[PDB]
């Protein structure tokens, strides 16, 4: 139910 998650800019996905 979260409109705006906190993105990790140094994650796994390229």
């Amino acid at each position, epitope marked *: 139910e*979260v*409109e*705006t*998650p*906190i993105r*990790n800019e140094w994650g*796994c996905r390229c």
Partner: nanobody
Amino acid sequence: VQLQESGGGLVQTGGSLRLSCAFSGFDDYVIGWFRQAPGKGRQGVSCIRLSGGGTIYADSAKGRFTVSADNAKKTVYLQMTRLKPEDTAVYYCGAERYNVEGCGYDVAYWGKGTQVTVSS
């Protein structure tokens, strides 16, 4: 599993407030703080990984808010400072299985919410 927020109230502009989230029934869980103003969506504020205490912040939380955990007390805290009227909202704690891409993508458990109101 259970989450319960406390510490909500009325704060003067520029003031501080500390919220608590009591947790029970946990694997590698994150406790996050999310806020929702009337008729708006839920916005991620700050999250902590209970295993090791690593943290991630929304841009507006950086510097002035600190999220922390006392695993012994099974409590997570959000210490807020320099509060403004735009910070007025229901604050929720939420739990999710650790996701390296960030916080708030799959919240599995929610607290009941605590009203924070900031005015002059």
